[PDB]
Amino acid sequence: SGFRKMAFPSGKVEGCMVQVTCGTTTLNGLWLDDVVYCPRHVICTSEDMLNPNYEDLLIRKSNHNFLVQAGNVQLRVIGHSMQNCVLKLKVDTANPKTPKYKFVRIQPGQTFSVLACYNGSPSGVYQCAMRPNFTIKGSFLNGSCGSVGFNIDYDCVSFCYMHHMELPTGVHAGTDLEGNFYGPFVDRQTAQAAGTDTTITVNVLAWLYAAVINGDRWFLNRFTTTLNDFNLVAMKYNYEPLTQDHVDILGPLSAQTGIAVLDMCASLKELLQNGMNGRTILGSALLEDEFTPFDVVRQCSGVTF
């Protein structure tokens, strides 16, 4: 009945987006309770960013050097501190629109929605996966830093990402909401290598199950394989090795479609060796790896929040 890359409804997060200005630099902050969270490089000049000493730069700043705006309202900053790569500004007003929330550090291969923001105002929402090399393939312009990634569980917002920088390959890097970067990255304007990326194999299988559920079945073959035999083909094509934990996660989808996981691996094997030779799967000519098994079950079961 159709399969789309779908983001969580962004309303609860929209109510937490504020604008943080320090000197000439403005970016986005996240206002929860009486604390505003933003990237610490808000305190940097364009020259500072080449080689910042953040402890020294922050010591030159006082509470009144930080301007925080929620729409047109001006919040008063009554304290500040650095936690890893995030700045925490204590304000005198608790956000009346604070949702039930958690801070989580997500695992590579997991997905989340991004609310892209500029000057404290939401611009758009999209879905992405934390790559195995801990980058994301986003859409971020200047001023977008401090935009956040999140998942929604019924009424609880789980914040997992805040945007900090663009890498030389054009992908994006950021932190969890405790300020710890995903991956080996630092918040400095210097050349930084992401590792070779790999394809999230369990996600591709989930999407193949999604395809079968939605009527696409041409890629199914009469072959099967073994976990070790498939992983031989995974390594060659830079796919993550498949484990029994992955098989178990795919179990419910196996049970609904009546297709054994290792049979799907053999179909995927032949796709990897023989290509698509011009056909499409769920409207894509590529093998898609940014849908988790949970994502597929949610979209095919119509879970609401």
| Catalytic residue, candidates 38, 145, 160, 265 | 145
For residue 228, what are the contacts with CB-CB under 8 A and spacing of at least 6?
none
Draw the binding track, 179-218, toward ligand A1ALF (x: CB under 6 A; -: no contact). --------xxxxx---------------------------
Residue 145 annotated among the catalytic residues of the structure: yes
Task: Give the binding range for ligand A1ALF (CB under 6 A) out of 12-20, 61-69, 73-81, 141-149.
Answer: 141-149
Binding of its own copies at residue 40 (CB under 8 A)? no
Q: Which amino acid is at 39?
A: P
* Least distance to ligand A1ALF, CB of residue 292, Å: 23
The site partner of 27 among ligand A1ALF, its own copies, none (C-beta below 5 to 8 Å per kind) is ligand A1ALF
Mode of pairing for the β-strands spanning 156-166 and 100-103? parallel
The site partner of 283 among its own copies, ligand A1ALF, none (C-beta below 5 to 8 Å per kind) is its own copies
Binding of ligand A1ALF at residue 77 (CB under 6 A)? no
CB hemisphere CA count around 174 (13 angstroms): 28
β-partners of residue 9 are none
Binding of its own copies at residue 2 (CB under 8 A)? yes
Nearer Cβ to ligand A1ALF, position 45 or 280?
45
The site partner of 157 among ligand A1ALF, its own copies, none (C-beta below 5 to 8 Å per kind) is none
Any idea what the Cα angle at residue 238 is, between residues 237 and 239, rounded to 5°? 95
Cα 279 off chain centre by: 29
For residue 278, what are the contacts with CB-CB under 8 A and spacing of at least 6?
none
For residue 226, what are the contacts with CB-CB under 8 A and spacing of at least 6?
262
Residue 91 sits at φ, ψ, to 5 deg, of -115, 165
| H helical segments located in 85-216 | 201-213
* Least distance to ligand A1ALF, CB of residue 212, Å: 17
Other C-beta atoms closer than 10 Å to the C-beta of 89 total: 24
Draw the binding track, 8-37, toward ligand A1ALF (x: CB under 6 A; -: no contact). -------------------x----------
Q: Are 112 and 145 a contacting pair, CB within 8 Å?
A: no
Contacts to ligand A1ALF by CB under 6 A: 1, 27, 41, 44, 49, 140-145, 164-166, 168, 172, 187-191
The catalytic residues are 41, 145
